[PDB]
């Protein structure tokens, strides 16, 4: 079945620039700016569009070793990005996949709002949960804040 979760985050970075960095260049940026959260990102197959698979490894001591994420859709106009966790981490005999959607929207103050949807697809009926969601949200926030800090400090990046 499907467990649906929606949340929002804010940033002081304009939407297009944040999308370019946080979404389109995550394979480079996440291990660079958040090494205590992400050890490495490996492109396994594909050239960045639908179906591209990446292996994201976590540092030693983290609850999980890695996940494989698959790009589902990338909308460069509307700053929408869809991807699925398809292997590793919580995925296995009780959880088929986690399908995610992020939209980054401009705000008139010059910042942005991120609208985030996570859908957990279970095999049979096993409960997803609050602890799993909390961990996911915390990781997302850590990554967002690290990328934002980098973009504040490097004005010529993604500009």
From Swiss-Prot:
One example of a Gene Ontology biological process annotation: abscisic acid-activated signaling pathway
Keyword flag Membrane: no
Hydrophobic ligand pocket, as annotated region: 115-117, 132-140
UniProt-recorded Gene Ontology molecular function terms: abscisic acid binding; protein phosphatase inhibitor activity; signaling receptor activity
Cellular component aspect of the GO annotation: cytoplasm; nucleus
Main location: cytoplasm
Assigned keywords, A-Z: Allergen, Cytoplasm, Pathogenesis-related protein, Plant defense
Pfam families named in the record: Bet_v_1
Subcellular location: Cytoplasm
Gene3D superfamilies membership: 3.30.530.20
Coiled-coil regions, chain positions: none
Tissue distribution: Pollen.
Record-listed brassinolide binding positions: 54, 81, 83, 100
Known function: May be a general steroid carrier protein.
Family membership: Belongs to the BetVI family.
Protein name: Major pollen allergen Bet v 1-J
Native organism: Betula pendula
Gene transcribed to yield this protein: BETV1J
């Amino acid at each position: 079945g499907v467990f649906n979760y929606e949340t929002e985050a804010t940033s002081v970075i304009p939407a297009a620039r944040l999308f370019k960095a946080f979404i389109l260049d995550g394979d480079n940026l996440f291990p660079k700016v958040a090494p205590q959260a992400i050890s490495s990102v490996e492109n396994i197959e594909g050239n960045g569009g639908p179906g591209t698979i990446k292996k994201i490894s976590f540092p030693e001591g983290f609850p999980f070793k890695y996940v494989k994420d698959r790009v589902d859709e990338v909308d460069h106009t509307n700053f929408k990005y869809s991807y699925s966790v398809i292997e590793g981490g919580p995925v296995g005999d009780t959880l088929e996949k986690i399908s995610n959607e992020i939209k980054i929207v401009a705000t008139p103050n010059g910042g942005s709002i991120l609208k985030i949807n996570n859908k957990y697809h279970t095999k049979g009926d096993h409960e997803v949960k609050a602890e799993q969601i909390k961990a996911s949200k915390e990781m997302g926030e850590t990554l967002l804040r690290a990328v934002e800090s980098y973009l504040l400090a490097h004005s010529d990046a993604y500009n």
